[PDB]
Write a protein that binds this ligand. Sequence first.
Ligand code: AGS
Ligand code: AGS
Ligand code: AGS
Ligand code: ADP
Ligand code: MG
Ligand code: MG
Ligand code: MG
Lengths: 327, 319, 338, 254, 258, 340
Amino acid sequence: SKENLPWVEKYRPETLDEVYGQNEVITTVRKFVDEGKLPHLLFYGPPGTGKTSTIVALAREIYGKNYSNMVLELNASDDRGIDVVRNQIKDFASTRQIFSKGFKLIILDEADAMTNAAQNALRRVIERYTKNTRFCVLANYAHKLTPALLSRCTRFRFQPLPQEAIERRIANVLVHEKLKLSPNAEKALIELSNGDMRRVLNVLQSCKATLDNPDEDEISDDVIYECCGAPRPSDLKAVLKSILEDDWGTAHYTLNKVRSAKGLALIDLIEGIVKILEDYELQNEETRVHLLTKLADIEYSISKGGNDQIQGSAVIGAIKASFENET
Amino acid sequence: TLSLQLPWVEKYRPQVLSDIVGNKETIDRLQQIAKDGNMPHMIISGMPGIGKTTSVHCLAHELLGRSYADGVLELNASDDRGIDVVRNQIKHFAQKKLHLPPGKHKIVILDEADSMTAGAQQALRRTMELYSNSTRFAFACNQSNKIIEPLQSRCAILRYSKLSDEDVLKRLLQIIKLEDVKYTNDGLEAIIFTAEGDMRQAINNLQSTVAGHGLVNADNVFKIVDSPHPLIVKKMLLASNLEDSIQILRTDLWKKGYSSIDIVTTSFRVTKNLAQVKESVRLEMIKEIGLTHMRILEGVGTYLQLASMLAKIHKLNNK
Amino acid sequence: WVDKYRPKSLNALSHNEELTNFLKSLSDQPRDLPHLLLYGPNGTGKKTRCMALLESIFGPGVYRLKIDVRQFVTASNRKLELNVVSSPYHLEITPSDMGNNDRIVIQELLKEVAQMEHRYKCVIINEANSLTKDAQAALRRTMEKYSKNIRLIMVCDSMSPIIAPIKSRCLLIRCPAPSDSEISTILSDVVTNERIQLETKDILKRIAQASNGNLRVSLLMLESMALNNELALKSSSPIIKPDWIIVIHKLTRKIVKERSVNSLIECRAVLYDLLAHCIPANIILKELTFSLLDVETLNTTNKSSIIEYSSVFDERLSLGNKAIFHLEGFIAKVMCCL
Amino acid sequence: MLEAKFEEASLFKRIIDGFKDCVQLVNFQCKEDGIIAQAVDDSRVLLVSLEIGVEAFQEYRCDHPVTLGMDLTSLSKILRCGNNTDTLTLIADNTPDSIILLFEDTKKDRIAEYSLKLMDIDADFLKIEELQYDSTLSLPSSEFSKIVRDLSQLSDSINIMITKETIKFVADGDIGSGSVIIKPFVDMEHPETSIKLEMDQPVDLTFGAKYLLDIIKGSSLSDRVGIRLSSEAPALFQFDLKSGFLQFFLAPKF
Amino acid sequence: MLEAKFEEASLFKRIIDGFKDCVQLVNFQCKEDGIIAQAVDDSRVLLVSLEIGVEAFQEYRCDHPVTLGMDLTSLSKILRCGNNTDTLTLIADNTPDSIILLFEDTKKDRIAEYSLKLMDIDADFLKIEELQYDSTLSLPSSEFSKIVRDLSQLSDSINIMITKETIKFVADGDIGSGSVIIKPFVDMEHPETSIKLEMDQPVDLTFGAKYLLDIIKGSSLSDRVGIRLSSEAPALFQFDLKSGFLQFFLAPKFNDEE
Amino acid sequence: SKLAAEQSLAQQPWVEKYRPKNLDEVTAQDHAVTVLKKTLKSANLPHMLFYGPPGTGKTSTILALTKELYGPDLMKSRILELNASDERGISIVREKVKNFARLTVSKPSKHDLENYPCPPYKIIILDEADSMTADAQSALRRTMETYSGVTRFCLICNYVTRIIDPLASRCSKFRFKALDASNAIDRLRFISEQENVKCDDGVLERILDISAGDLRRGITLLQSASKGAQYLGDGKNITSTQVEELAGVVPHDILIEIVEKVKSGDFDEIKKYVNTFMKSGWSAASVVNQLHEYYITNDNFDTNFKNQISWLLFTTDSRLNNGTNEHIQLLNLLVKISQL
DNA sequence: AGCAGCAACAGAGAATCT
DNA sequence: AGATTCTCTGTTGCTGC
Ligand SMILES: Nc1ncnc2c1ncn2[C@@H]1O[C@H](COP(=O)(O)OP(=O)(O)OP(O)(O)=S)[C@@H](O)[C@H]1O
Ligand SMILES: Nc1ncnc2c1ncn2[C@@H]1O[C@H](COP(=O)(O)OP(=O)(O)OP(O)(O)=S)[C@@H](O)[C@H]1O
Ligand SMILES: Nc1ncnc2c1ncn2[C@@H]1O[C@H](COP(=O)(O)OP(=O)(O)OP(O)(O)=S)[C@@H](O)[C@H]1O
Ligand SMILES: Nc1ncnc2c1ncn2[C@@H]1O[C@H](COP(=O)(O)OP(=O)(O)O)[C@@H](O)[C@H]1O
Ligand SMILES: [Mg+2]
Ligand SMILES: [Mg+2]
Ligand SMILES: [Mg+2]
């Protein structure tokens, strides 16, 4: 049953009308398929944007419910070498369908992990067998693909999910589940997503589990922040104010009590302070240079461990010394 | 839907050497060779999508006439091209008896010659030397340095260059006339700008824009085929003030879904190939772009690292 | 000799009485014993104290040990060859005898010893600082999965390269270097047992002042200078210094005397000759910097820059593999500073 | 539940030999009228389809169909314990995580029993067989194997061409070309050697030699092989069993 | 001196086939009552021990024992010249640097003679056989080979369990588990197919499948195999010869010990 | 059977003796165990990614969850645990992990369904995912994306940055918080009472203060203090000084001597005192941490001095976190802070 | 200090011929 | 029925990226 799959897998789009966020590419692909001229596609974009769902729904709309048989889907989990290409992909492209009549579809998902020799062998397979089969390459990084292979396909960039589409999907999930969500809670949820539907679905399931109730109540900002462990804008701005204006010992005490009262992480506070200070209209860019350099150094040091108190004091001192040049 | 139509790159693929709008010198050279005969061993190098495979295909077709089926041996990178293949099949084809006109020869086309192993390339030397009177070799590669010098010593070297704006514009105008498409000057200009000397990519973008919107206009081309990635990165690095570069990185690159690895790597390429600033400042910018890369390869790839890289580059440019 | 007079039990220790009492406390109940990590200066006597603690956890047969050999296969049939020190109650492995293949030996050998098993068999990991981060990560879960059959006693000189999970997974025991007085008392018993002739006792103190807490170096230097004075130490017996220390001192003299590229070439040559004779580059850098700071011709401004450059290039050497590439850079930076 | 006892473990071993190598995953389904199994190779050009009726077994009981998927390699690894003459019983509950293979000798003596781990495969049996094919022919399977083994050496493609009273196999590659021409004929001295051909329309199809080579294995299950060709669908090569058949559907090269 | 003539070179070739692969060095010793040989693998979990009495030979003369060590691989390389029906004579002086293998056909015609270089091995023959084992069983060796070949595919460990009137071989690994259960029985229609079992105490030991696979080779020397198991010592698998025997002693896995 | 397990636990060190067996034993990581308890009644366990400081209880939490889910019978049949002591290349991830994921779930027994929920999926956990290469990690993407109906993936790591972005997006991120005195004093007091650890008033809270968010190190220090107090047999209570002595903490007077040498003194005196201090074995990380606490906490230094001392201590800790020589780094730090 | 892709060599199994 | 030869598969080593 579908009630056992996680929310990321349960709510996977099955038709092209359930893929939100991407409109300019979805309409163009629908027109390509209706008019017949479907070229070799290259879906490039960040994780969680809906490239795999888009191509799966496309193959479903093209071949019907028997998609799992008329399409050759290869990914990084499967062995994709040059010999694998030579045998499997060439035998698939050269032959025809065993279930119906029509062009074939080869979905090379996550093809950014393929060997250079494999791409060099495939770039002539795409150019030779082009009247009976098509190629779809999904990628997160366009630098791992050879320029020859990159030039044979039409590139579609999957933009991050905007506010309207992600709110539409959230409303769809809140309709499918016996769940209510606060408006400010929804805004905070959209803020900690960066256009990643996977994160939204995961944390929505997690905060529904956090409710502890038969779901007669609502999900507020407190639930989201306590479940995702993300700092609140209130505590963020309080720490920033105490760092910018208050005394050194008082700033240290404030940072300690804020990061220990809710168990917040220093890296999340660093990213939040970076995001907040990005809107600050500042004087001569030397302060911004020092701030960015020191904050990136502290983040790279945190990414390897160390003393949290020493790193917090380093953040405080870096912000203070950076702002001391603004006078 | 039941079947698709042939793409314009394959449908309008040139079949005669006159239809090629590539490098005029080498094109007339190959045309005179096909007219007179006595085709020598050749290695055609260049960049993807400029008319290298089509050129050698047209040359072989025009030179062999109807005997193309039994006189031309095509081997691509999709087929096994190791030492065993060169030893058995290529040698059997070169030793094969075939009655040809007194001006033609058997042609062995080897696509993607830069991918053949060292053993096969070494074995091909005497293979092409002992049968150089009834078998000729034509290599098509992108990097001539990947082919050993002994093989390059026995053949001509044809280096294909990028296609100027005029040639791609003329070819696109011919395709539009042959297809009856509604277009405009700014749309074709945007297409050629996003092509970057790539004729195949230009025709592909044109066909995609036609099948997606019908009218080839700059707005449609820009909304379907995003502007060149390296140009926005160059404009970001060449910014004079830190806030302008930060806003460019935020809106154009980060808010549109470009990964940090692509941004930093495109950034490295732009710098390496930069010519506006001096050598020392370019080396310092490349050095800074490197630490950000090392930190991103270690999994610390975020917007703060790119912001710090830009800040360090500006500090270097800050005398 | 160092080996002829060495304690074999906890009651035979003659310095750090608080550490001996802590070891006796830890060995009172031996079955509920967690993993241990002995850290401190090199030459303090932690490897003797670990064996003395094993002598309290088990019978006196812990010292009757044997050397065996075990072969391993990496991806290549290359048979990594590793010798093992084994005892009927414990075993000792030194992953510092190979390159980046520490993880394979660690995981395979420890899994074999843990699957075969007072009730547990002790494991002594010698020189845990040379353990690569991947080998330490592999040992991280092996320390916890098999805690009723395998107990680790890791001997190291500095917990700086040891990862935080391993640090947390074992008790930490510090071994401070013995005071000059205890070293002098030990040397007194040694010279009365080895029948050495001392005109004045204070020379022994000077030996301590020349060893910097190292007992292994102290006894060896005492015996080396006892052979030059023919078993009769006088009031002004010269101090026997190792050859590499003299080479480093001459290198610092050359550094402070001449600062040029022509001298940088011979400095690189001296560094090559030192590295080719089984001398680590970190110790070379440490001794070079410490003896350069002792140069009275320089001032505080020079010494501060010297120590900063030495820290920077020590980080470089800990992050690099071509040690001379960092040593020559540090030497050039010091030349530019002076 | 699954409860199927083969008189001779050998029959099952030869059947599996047919799926062997050319496919990795097989989906079995037992039911009231027997057992069926389907396997498709990765490139999707070959489908191996089996049908064993109730009468092919010495004992068969089914009150509740069971579908089970498995790795063929794992299955064949275990399929060499049959002594050929051993008795083989396939056993599984209604919601299995494994399939039990039980080999026993006549006497109580030796009992080899295996418990093979199953794979979850989305049930999706194909029904691509045609009502009528352009041409139909049968001939001794050993003869078909030789024909395939001959030509295979010359090319990676073997063409089958059918015209009135003529069947022609052709391969053409680097070293040269080859052809095998056979004609329909009834041998009364023993009709298992005859070559029948019913042509409604001349056909001319090309197949990848590597696949025909996989298919010839069926010779070990039947004396004759039936080949049905069409320009509209995958070709069918069929090997009849006593109550059943092993079928190979192969898509022609485009 | 060493002077042992085998009627058929084949017997010696099959005997050496038994040491083959699983051991590298073999130490032979000829004496007044015959020839013995011992070989231990590198991990020391398997000992191969041979005994050939004087009566197994067509001619045997020994007035002075000789001990000689050699590389097994070198020996087998030379052990395919026997034509099986050829006559084989092993020859060596009292202080040998080599061992001479002399193959001759009935008629004076073909004489193939080899001079194999010897290795110096510290003489240290083991005597690990027990007086009584927990359980003893014999069964056709071809049956034992099949049992081992079955289970081997499933795991690197094969367990042998013995209870009253029951012998059970079991393997359990990744793809699943398997077991072969056999019961004692006397077949008068030909007793070489019977399965005997004498159990003084139930036993349950695990062995490394790679080693049992080496051991099954003895089938070529005898119709039956004797298996003696104990919880106190290496298991003994024995293949009888006419006047002699080939024995394999295998240490049970402790949990991980071949 | 069970009694042998009880005795082996009783003869086991306190770290493994008091390992959380149920989801209720988790004292401080409540946000994660609440979701884990809620999904125990449902059947929609998503792919999870535990990350946080070492010793926070990630492995213990996942073990307790798998136990409460499957029972001690299915605990060994529906779990695939891969640690850092095993090979986890592309070959292993493609063969073994994918074969286990593609396999069907084992049939539960009659006693399993009566007491445990027995979900229709199995669990594949990968402990210490920091050592996994990024290509072997990307190989797991579709493996965990397509076979989610039959298996669930649980990644465990300390640095969440070492895991690629797609894997971090596919799994639900669970951040384990540091276990300071506040949220772990209850667990420490429970461990002390269960072992009759007679201590003073401010010992346990001090122990966690030395632990810096690490309950494993705190339990180890408590066990060491209890052993040292039982060996003496005086019947007194453990003191905070006795605890900080064996914890590697430099005494207050020795640190005040360092402060005096830094404040007043030249390069030579500071170098000599550092050479003397390095003779007594102290961890440079602890000395740097104590100096940082003293300098930032003391309200007698200028803010301009405080920014510089914070940056210098940060640089020194970052350099020490790479395996450098403690003596050189400590001397450089003290010299740099003496010039201020 | 992986992998991979490789290619070559050796061993084992199956088939055919005497 | 046994022996020999040929073919196929697997493992190891070397080279290149
Ligand atoms: N545009 C979208 N509309 C609705 N749901 C979406 C959308 N994009 C992602 N999702 C959800 O996120 C899940 C994962 O989507 P995927 O297509 O697998 O992500 P992706 O774009 O392929 O990025 P990868 O796989 O990490 S490279 C889907 O099953 C949906 O539940
Ligand atoms: N000079 C040209 N004139 C007309 N069409 C061209 C020209 N060059 C390329 N094209 C088009 O581009 C398609 C592909 O050209 P190719 O010759 O295959 O590219 P290439 O120069 O060989 O670079 P590769 O194959 O990536 S190494 C042709 O089928 C044409 O449609
Ligand atoms: N939240 C907790 N509640 C109770 N005991 C805990 C808790 N966290 C850790 N412990 C104790 O610390 C021991 C180690 O737990 P682990 O789960 O291995 O720590 P960890 O988070 O895995 O650290 P690693 O493995 O270095 S990342 C457990 O056996 C407990 O005794
Ligand atoms: N308790 C002790 N009393 C006297 N000498 C000792 C004692 N412990 C160790 N020593 C000696 O002091 C020196 C210490 O150096 P070494 O043994 O190498 O240290 P470690 O045990 O840390 O490796 C050796 O000569 C050693 O035998
Ligand atoms: Mg995807
Ligand atoms: Mg080309
Ligand atoms: Mg853990």
